[PDB]
Amino acid sequence: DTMKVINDPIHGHIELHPLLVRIIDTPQFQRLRYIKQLGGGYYVFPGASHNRFEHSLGVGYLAGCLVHALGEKQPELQISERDVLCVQIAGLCRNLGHGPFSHMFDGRFIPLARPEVKWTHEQGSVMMFEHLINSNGIKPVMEQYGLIPEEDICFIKEQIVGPLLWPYKGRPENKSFLYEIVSNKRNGIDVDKWDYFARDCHHLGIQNNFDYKRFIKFARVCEVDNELRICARDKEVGNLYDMFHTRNSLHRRAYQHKVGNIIDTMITDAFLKADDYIEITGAGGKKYRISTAIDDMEAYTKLTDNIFLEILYSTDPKLKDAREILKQIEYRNLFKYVGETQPTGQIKIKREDYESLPKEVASAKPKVLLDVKLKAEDFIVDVINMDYGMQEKNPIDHVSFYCKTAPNRAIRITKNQVSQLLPEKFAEQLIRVYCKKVDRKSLYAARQYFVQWCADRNFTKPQDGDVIAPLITPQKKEWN
Amino acid sequence: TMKVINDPIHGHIELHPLLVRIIDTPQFQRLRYIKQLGGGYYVFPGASHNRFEHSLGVGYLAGCLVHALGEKQPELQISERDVLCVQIAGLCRNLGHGPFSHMFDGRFIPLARPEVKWTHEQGSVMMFEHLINSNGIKPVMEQYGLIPEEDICFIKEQIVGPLESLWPYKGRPENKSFLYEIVSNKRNGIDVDKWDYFARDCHHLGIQNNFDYKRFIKFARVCEVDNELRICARDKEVGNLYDMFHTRNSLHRRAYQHKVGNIIDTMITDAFLKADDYIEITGAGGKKYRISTAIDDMEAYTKLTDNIFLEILYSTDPKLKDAREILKQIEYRNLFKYVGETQPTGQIKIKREDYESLPKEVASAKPKVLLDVKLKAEDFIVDVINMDYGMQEKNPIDHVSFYCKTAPNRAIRITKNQVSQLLPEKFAEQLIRVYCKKVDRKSLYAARQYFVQWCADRNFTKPQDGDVIAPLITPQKKEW
Amino acid sequence: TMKVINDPIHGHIELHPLLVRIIDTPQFQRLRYIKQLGGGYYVFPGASHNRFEHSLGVGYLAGCLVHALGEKQPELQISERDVLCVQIAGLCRNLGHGPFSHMFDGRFIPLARPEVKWTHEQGSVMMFEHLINSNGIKPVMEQYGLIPEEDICFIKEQIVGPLELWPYKGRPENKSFLYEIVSNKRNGIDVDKWDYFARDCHHLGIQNNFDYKRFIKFARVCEVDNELRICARDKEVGNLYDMFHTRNSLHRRAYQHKVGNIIDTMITDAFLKADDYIEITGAGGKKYRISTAIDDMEAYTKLTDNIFLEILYSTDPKLKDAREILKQIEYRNLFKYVGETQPTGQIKIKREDYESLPKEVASAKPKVLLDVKLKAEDFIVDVINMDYGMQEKNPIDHVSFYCKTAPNRAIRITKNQVSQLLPEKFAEQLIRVYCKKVDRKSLYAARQYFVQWCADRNFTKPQDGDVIAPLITPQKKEWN
Amino acid sequence: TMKVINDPIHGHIELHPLLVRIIDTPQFQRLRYIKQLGGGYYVFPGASHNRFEHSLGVGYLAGCLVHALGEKQPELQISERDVLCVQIAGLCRNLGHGPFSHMFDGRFIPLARPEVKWTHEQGSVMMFEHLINSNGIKPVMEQYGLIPEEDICFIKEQIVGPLLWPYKGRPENKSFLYEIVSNKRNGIDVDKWDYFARDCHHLGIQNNFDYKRFIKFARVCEVDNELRICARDKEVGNLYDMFHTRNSLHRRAYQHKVGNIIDTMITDAFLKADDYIEITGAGGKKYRISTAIDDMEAYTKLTDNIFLEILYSTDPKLKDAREILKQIEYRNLFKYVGETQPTGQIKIKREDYESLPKEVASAKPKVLLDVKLKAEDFIVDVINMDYGMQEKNPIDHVSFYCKTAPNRAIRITKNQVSQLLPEKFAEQLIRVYCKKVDRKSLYAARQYFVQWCADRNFTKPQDGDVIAPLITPQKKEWN
Numbered sequence A: 001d002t003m004k005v006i007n008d009p010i011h012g013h014i015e016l017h018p019l020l021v022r023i024i025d026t027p028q029f030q031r032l033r034y035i036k037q038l039g040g041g042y043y044v045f046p047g048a049s050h051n052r053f054e055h056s057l058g059v060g061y062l063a064g065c066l067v068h069a070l071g072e073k074q075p076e077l078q079i080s081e082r083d084v085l086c087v088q089i090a091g092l093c094r095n096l097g098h099g100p101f102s103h104m105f106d107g108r109f110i111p112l113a114r115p116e117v118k119w120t121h122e123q124g125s126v127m128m129f130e131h132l133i134n135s136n137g138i139k140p141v142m143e144q145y146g147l148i149p150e151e152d153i154c155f156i157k158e159q160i161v162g163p164l165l166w167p168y169k170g171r172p173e174n175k176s177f178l179y180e181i182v183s184n185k186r187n188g189i190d191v192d193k194w195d196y197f198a199r200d201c202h203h204l205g206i207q208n209n210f211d212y213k214r215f216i217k218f219a220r221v222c223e224v225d226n227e228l229r230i231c232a233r234d235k236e237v238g239n240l241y242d243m244f245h246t247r248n249s250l251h252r253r254a255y256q257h258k259v260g261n262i263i264d265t266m267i268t269d270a271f272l273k274a275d276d277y278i279e280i281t282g283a284g285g286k287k288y289r290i291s292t293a294i295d296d297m298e299a300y301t302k303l304t305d306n307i308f309l310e311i312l313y314s315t316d317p318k319l320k321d322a323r324e325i326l327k328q329i330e331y332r333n334l335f336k337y338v339g340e341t342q343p344t345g346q347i348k349i350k351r352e353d354y355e356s357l358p359k360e361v362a363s364a365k366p367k368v369l370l371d372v373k374l375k376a377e378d379f380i381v382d383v384i385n386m387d388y389g390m391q392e393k394n395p396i397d398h399v400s401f402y403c404k405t406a407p408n409r410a411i412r413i414t415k416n417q418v419s420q421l422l423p424e425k426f427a428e429q430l431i432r433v434y435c436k437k438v439d440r441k442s443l444y445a446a447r448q449y450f451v452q453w454c455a456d457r458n459f460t461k462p463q464d465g466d467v468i469a470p471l472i473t474p475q476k477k478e479w480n
Numbered sequence B: 001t002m003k004v005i006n007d008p009i010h011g012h013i014e015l016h017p018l019l020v021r022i023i024d025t026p027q028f029q030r031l032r033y034i035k036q037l038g039g040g041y042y043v044f045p046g047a048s049h050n051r052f053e054h055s056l057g058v059g060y061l062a063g064c065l066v067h068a069l070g071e072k073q074p075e076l077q078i079s080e081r082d083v084l085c086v087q088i089a090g091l092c093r094n095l096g097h098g099p100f101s102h103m104f105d106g107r108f109i110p111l112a113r114p115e116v117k118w119t120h121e122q123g124s125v126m127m128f129e130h131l132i133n134s135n136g137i138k139p140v141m142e143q144y145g146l147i148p149e150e151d152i153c154f155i156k157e158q159i160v161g162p163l164e165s166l167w168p169y170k171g172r173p174e175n176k177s178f179l180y181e182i183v184s185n186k187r188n189g190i191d192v193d194k195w196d197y198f199a200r201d202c203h204h205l206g207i208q209n210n211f212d213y214k215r216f217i218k219f220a221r222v223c224e225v226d227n228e229l230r231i232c233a234r235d236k237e238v239g240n241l242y243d244m245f246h247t248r249n250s251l252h253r254r255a256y257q258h259k260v261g262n263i264i265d266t267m268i269t270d271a272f273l274k275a276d277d278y279i280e281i282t283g284a285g286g287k288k289y290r291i292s293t294a295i296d297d298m299e300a301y302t303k304l305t306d307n308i309f310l311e312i313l314y315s316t317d318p319k320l321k322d323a324r325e326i327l328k329q330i331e332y333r334n335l336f337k338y339v340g341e342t343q344p345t346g347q348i349k350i351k352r353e354d355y356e357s358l359p360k361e362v363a364s365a366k367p368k369v370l371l372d373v374k375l376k377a378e379d380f381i382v383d384v385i386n387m388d389y390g391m392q393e394k395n396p397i398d399h400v401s402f403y404c405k406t407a408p409n410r411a412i413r414i415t416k417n418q419v420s421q422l423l424p425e426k427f428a429e430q431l432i433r434v435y436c437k438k439v440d441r442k443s444l445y446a447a448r449q450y451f452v453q454w455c456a457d458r459n460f461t462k463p464q465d466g467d468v469i470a471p472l473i474t475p476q477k478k479e480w
Numbered sequence C: 001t002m003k004v005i006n007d008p009i010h011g012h013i014e015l016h017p018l019l020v021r022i023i024d025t026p027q028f029q030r031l032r033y034i035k036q037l038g039g040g041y042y043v044f045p046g047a048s049h050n051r052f053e054h055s056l057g058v059g060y061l062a063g064c065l066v067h068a069l070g071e072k073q074p075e076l077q078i079s080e081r082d083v084l085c086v087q088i089a090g091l092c093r094n095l096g097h098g099p100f101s102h103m104f105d106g107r108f109i110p111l112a113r114p115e116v117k118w119t120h121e122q123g124s125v126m127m128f129e130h131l132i133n134s135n136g137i138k139p140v141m142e143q144y145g146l147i148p149e150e151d152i153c154f155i156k157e158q159i160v161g162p163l164e165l166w167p168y169k170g171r172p173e174n175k176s177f178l179y180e181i182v183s184n185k186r187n188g189i190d191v192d193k194w195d196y197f198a199r200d201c202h203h204l205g206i207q208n209n210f211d212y213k214r215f216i217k218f219a220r221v222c223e224v225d226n227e228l229r230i231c232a233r234d235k236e237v238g239n240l241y242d243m244f245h246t247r248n249s250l251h252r253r254a255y256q257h258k259v260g261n262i263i264d265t266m267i268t269d270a271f272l273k274a275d276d277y278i279e280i281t282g283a284g285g286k287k288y289r290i291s292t293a294i295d296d297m298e299a300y301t302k303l304t305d306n307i308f309l310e311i312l313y314s315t316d317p318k319l320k321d322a323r324e325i326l327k328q329i330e331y332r333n334l335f336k337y338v339g340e341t342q343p344t345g346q347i348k349i350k351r352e353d354y355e356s357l358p359k360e361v362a363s364a365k366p367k368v369l370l371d372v373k374l375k376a377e378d379f380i381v382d383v384i385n386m387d388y389g390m391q392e393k394n395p396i397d398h399v400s401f402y403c404k405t406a407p408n409r410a411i412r413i414t415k416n417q418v419s420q421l422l423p424e425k426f427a428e429q430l431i432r433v434y435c436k437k438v439d440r441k442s443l444y445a446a447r448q449y450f451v452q453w454c455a456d457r458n459f460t461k462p463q464d465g466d467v468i469a470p471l472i473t474p475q476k477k478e479w480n
Numbered sequence D: 001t002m003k004v005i006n007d008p009i010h011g012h013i014e015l016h017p018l019l020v021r022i023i024d025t026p027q028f029q030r031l032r033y034i035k036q037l038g039g040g041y042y043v044f045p046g047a048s049h050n051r052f053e054h055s056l057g058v059g060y061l062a063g064c065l066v067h068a069l070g071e072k073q074p075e076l077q078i079s080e081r082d083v084l085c086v087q088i089a090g091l092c093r094n095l096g097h098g099p100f101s102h103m104f105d106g107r108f109i110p111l112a113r114p115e116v117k118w119t120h121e122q123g124s125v126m127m128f129e130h131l132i133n134s135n136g137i138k139p140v141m142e143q144y145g146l147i148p149e150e151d152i153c154f155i156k157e158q159i160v161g162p163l164l165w166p167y168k169g170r171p172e173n174k175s176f177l178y179e180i181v182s183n184k185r186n187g188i189d190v191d192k193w194d195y196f197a198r199d200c201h202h203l204g205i206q207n208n209f210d211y212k213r214f215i216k217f218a219r220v221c222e223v224d225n226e227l228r229i230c231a232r233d234k235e236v237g238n239l240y241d242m243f244h245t246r247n248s249l250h251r252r253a254y255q256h257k258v259g260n261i262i263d264t265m266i267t268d269a270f271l272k273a274d275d276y277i278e279i280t281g282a283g284g285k286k287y288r289i290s291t292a293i294d295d296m297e298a299y300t301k302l303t304d305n306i307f308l309e310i311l312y313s314t315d316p317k318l319k320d321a322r323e324i325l326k327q328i329e330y331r332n333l334f335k336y337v338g339e340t341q342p343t344g345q346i347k348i349k350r351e352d353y354e355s356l357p358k359e360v361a362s363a364k365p366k367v368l369l370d371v372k373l374k375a376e377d378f379i380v381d382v383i384n385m386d387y388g389m390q391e392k393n394p395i396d397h398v399s400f401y402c403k404t405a406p407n408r409a410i411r412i413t414k415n416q417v418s419q420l421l422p423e424k425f426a427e428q429l430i431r432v433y434c435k436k437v438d439r440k441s442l443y444a445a446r447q448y449f450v451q452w453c454a455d456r457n458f459t460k461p462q463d464g465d466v467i468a469p470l471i472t473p474q475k476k477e478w479n
Ligand SMILES: Nc1nc2c(ncn2[C@@H]2O[C@H](COP(=O)(O)OP(=O)(O)OP(=O)(O)O)[C@@H](O)[C@H]2O)c(=O)[nH]1
Pocket: C003, C004, C005, C006, C020, C023, C024, D041, D042, D043, D044, D045, D258, D331, D335, D336
């Protein structure tokens, strides 16, 4: 084996070490070719054809870039080629656990199909990685290139999912900075974002990307509270605030697009309807369901966006209901968007409260004459938590900086030191309401319920409120 | 009414409601599940794009061109009816593509059904009819002022040429002849399909080359040529046109005919042939078809996409074992091995009927070198690629009409000699790639000896690595 | 005939012959010799671009917007005459810029001629008048159907606002929306920004811009307060906030770059020193100074970045002091950046106070031993007002929107209806301090004065404060 | 410490302190005031870029290549000293360019000072010497481990070639280093790589060569008894494409008919101003635009500024020069008449160039003309278009290697690649312009021009049947 070059449209020509190639050329990794990065987003942004596979290559490459840069700049860190490869592998493999349509699977389907279990794509990535290593005899190949499987497989898993006092076993405290590259638990500034910003923008057809190359050139390792951490140059602080602003922009415009979400919702509904009747064969010929394939990696290996088409193309009558929903997607007969609002002030909505919300909307009594009367089951309520990655916290408060005059001395920089034009809050909730009845009269009624409900709950006035519900909006004194 | 879509290539494009109705059908949406470049994605990880988004682009550019001509030359009497028909033809010219695009019509069908002659273009017309009839489009066409009898004919003619002189078209008369040059230009191949795929494929492939269609549109005009109204280019654009075809040739050499992309397409085709007996696709009336016969029924063909690849890969039926095994080898990157490339010298051209014999010929070569292993015809694959400027031996620029700034209504011809001596002296050639199914080191060495000997025996060109792969053979040929 | 130009930002643009005639004059061609970003080029080597190409872009976008509105809403009665007037205003709104753009109106003139109030906008109107009269344009305007009396008034009003109830004479109230295109006095959303965002980013090497093409597609004219105004679709509100965020980012990183500014400051200083000795010939053979060329357009026509080189290459001993400063720029022996701070709370710094500030810093009395003692004249204090274009106000409160369900009904959208992640203030001040003595000991001293002076005035703690002034920062409890 | 700078083409690049010191001098900064494409800006409004930023790019790419080779092949013994010398050469290879770049060496000097043979390359070496000596760089070079005697020689040799192994700056084992900045063997060098990307970015054409790909597949192998840079066999197509792109750029942009004529007008103005402009050089001595190349202190002050000095002048002696520049501003340019090429064997010699306007005026078109034109009314511009090696194919002078034997250099012939490639690699374009711009003069000039083409058996101009319908029928060959 020798090193391979591959042309990526985002990064150009990148080199891949033979070990990485061996990892890539497996059913477990190749599976990522058949999972869309943005799931239902493609049905809104026709440029967004990209899959997890190419994103993974980018993440692995950037992980390598960062660790190489640090090693060249600071030999004293004692970064070894062994270290570099482990970081690249973690980067490559951090997306291994994603399921059909990416966040839809993790975010919508599994929570509804298997409420008892707690599952995340991160956990899946670690399990898949284990399966990949074992199924394809990788450990011998790792030792051939100087890796120590016991320590290094631990290290790689830890980089992806965190710890399985210094809580890490894969590397010691002096190599702490290595854990900040692939998946940064401290502040979320990592190479995964850097790739998806550039990649998604290229495919979506939008600007606003983050300059990671610049950032890498000004990154350094310094001691902070007896730990070696990656620090940014002071002047980059504005760029970091911009980075998270960009993330928020991308989520508003693309990843949480009202219609993209509704399509994901419909797909999830179809999957629930099909869950009983689809069988996926796993280890030992044993059969699993869409919802239980996460228990067996051999079965999960076979679980991709394909299932969408399996259902769509099915002829079995048991799958009729599921198939019908997907057909409605093709005809673009989607559930209709009614509107969006937000909680005012201190109110926050708990996940346990989510199931009640359609009931609440149907319970509203708008003082308007209606031809039709709608029920809880006719409404969909989608609650979206928008933040800078750290719930209420400002991630920049958890970044360490250094200045030109003392490169080894780490410092903190507060928001007030940067700008008054920055956000005063770093978390919020969006509530979108849709109606399953698409007819004109139903839709009119749904708007009356929706706006009334917003008023009843003292939520923010929807932007089109005066148009969609002119009779309702005047009642609320606050609104005008 | 109008829908706006963000396309990463063209930006925000408007779509007329009629076009939206056509798009929102199973027949059109199917194009989301067919890769533009098929196996190319397995070589260029940026090339995740599907036929769907390319189709939008072609339809939009078709509209751009016809609009531009109408603004510039009102006397042409171009109607909104005309504009819509051209846009529909642009949208729908890719409807007939099958799994992995050119693989299907280029490799699979010719081998699976040799008696039949089938092209994606014919498929597009049949699919279009099925789309119209299945979704009640004709009433909607009339609603927007189209005349289905004439206009459906016109649209089909734009895609496939005459359905049968002097004037062979029924959809529009001679005065509107220029309209037939927009979507699919049979005269010289200069059309909006190429313009979109150049820009789109380069964006996704990661290569900066493309053709400036926007410039070209600004200098395009309609003039009378031989009693026909034709689109003419400004004289100064002649160099850019030669460059356009050069770009096309570059793209084919580097990407579309990439040695490994082709071999992957070949393996997939082989797997499909092995699965053809056992896969069933349900068409009209519940009747079952095979991969190779789904082209007979559009309802079945509607369900025939890249999905089939995964159906086979994930199958457990033992009858599909052989097919499934081939696809598994693809995932492990255990591909048939590239041996080399050569070209015919001088007079000789290779006929399609000769294609079967070629592996036999290579196995029949007797290299004068000691070999551990002896290879057979069945161990070789020979892939013959015709590279040209779209018109076999002819120069497409000889079939372009120009005009000059001093007499915009007077059409002229421009010969190659009037432009440059740095242009090609031929416009067609053949590439011959040889692969070996036995991948082991000793087999591979042997295959190289057969190959190079064969080239010498047939007076083909010396392979570029010939002195390295077959140092004992190359000296025998004095020419080399 | 129409002329076509290839602009790297917009591609191939058509220009009406009238516009070409305006462009092909000394008054317009002068813009080739004025850098868009002045001293910025000395920090961003990509930023070679001049006012000339930016002007073409603004003119073209002005045309795009007005064309789009006309096509969408014929009832507006927009005439080709209207379209040309808007394009001319767009082309000519940058005519009044002087050497190094904002340096000239922002730094040089205020210091050279404090009694006078002068702006590039005023200059643009005067230059335009001179251009028209010097080159016999009025006859050509009439040839293409313009009415010079009304239309020249209209064009000047678009650039500078009312030349003084409907306050405009160039067009009536029904055409009020036309005044929002080139230079939008109501909220600053205009085509000038749209071009410079894209152009500067292309040249600077920053991937950010605003998608004006999207915005244009969703723009409409509606009646607001008995005036016809351009309204944006409700869903674009987030993009508008993003637009102003991008503007702020660009000012922070590029237009107010600490070094770019100091270079502009040095150039200004050199100009002041040369002002007495340079002569520029204006109308009647008559001589003016850099600072008085603004009084005569014939002289101002000859006033460009050239003067920089005139001084640099001079041999006259009277120009020695000026020439020496420019030489220091070439050797990169610049005044040294000491640091940046901001006023706390609601403290604001008045323009009249600016001269006193260097004195205040020299007066500070840091409790540290210093080898050297610095004086007011050794300090430069640069006060930068950063806002969203409307001082304290939020421009989005002065935008009108419409919704999908009632396109003719204008609405307002408050910040609270959009997001809590938006800024709570829309204006702030940055204070940069530099030292004219560049030696190590002087620089160390300057840092102590600076930080002490921040503490004394309860300004924000400089980002590197603990490093540059470790003995000073502990005294201030607030800081830590 | 290293300086980081943002270049729109390459992104954020690091510069070694020594390189910064070289850059921060009047001799280098002067390149900010010289347009990369001269008169091209007056056709492509994107092309505002100057030699300065291009020079940074070339220096950076020179560094990239040498770094890549060193990492891949430690056995080459490439030292940091070597890397810096290559970067400096890259930075400084454009130092010798004059007002409006190629206009100055290509048009002005040849006419102003025919006896002298001058090239920007020679200027770059002289400027470099002046830069080093004026700014005390040698001490700074030794501070960073360079050996000025050997290394300054090496740098000059990289720019201009030699001043048996003919190089003194480095020995035969380091021969590959001379192929990076300015490749005399086949023209494949980092200068091109930067200007392709840079010019395309500014021009607004999406054309280009992937140098990053190429660097990844470049290797050093022994060829003859010389260590040379070799390309992977599979890159051969890309190399042919590279030169095709170069040709495309020259046709569409660098030799644009109008960009050339503007350059020609500016040159004419400079000739008219040459007597009356004075530039102060060493010892307070005065030079002319045409003699400033003799003194680097004067040449340092010679930039695109001179264009504006003339334009803004009020001295009556500069009236004629000033008037020409004014015509440029009004867009009252000399008019393009047409373009043709020589047929078959024929080539046009440089000595023949002065006669050409006379020949065109001597043509006797059989058409009635209101006005009669003279030699002085015509401009004839002969452009040699080639792949950088006159008649030769540069790819015949490239060495390749194959994946199965990376240390074994090979040759690859055109026939082994494709029959769609060019059969010739050099040609000549002949553009004719007229100084009389009125409609009737133009019409006349077209008749002279086309007649002249026919008389000389040159190729039929593309618009010939339109501009000279009465002339084209006479020539049977044409039709
Ligand atoms: N007029 C003009 N054109 C410019 C300018 N900058 C770039 N151009 C481009 O230069 C091209 C060629 O210049 P032209 O003025 O057309 O010269 P020409 O074609 O020989 O003369 P025309 O017959 O008048 O077109 C034009 O097509 C423009 O696209 C400018 O400042 N003024």
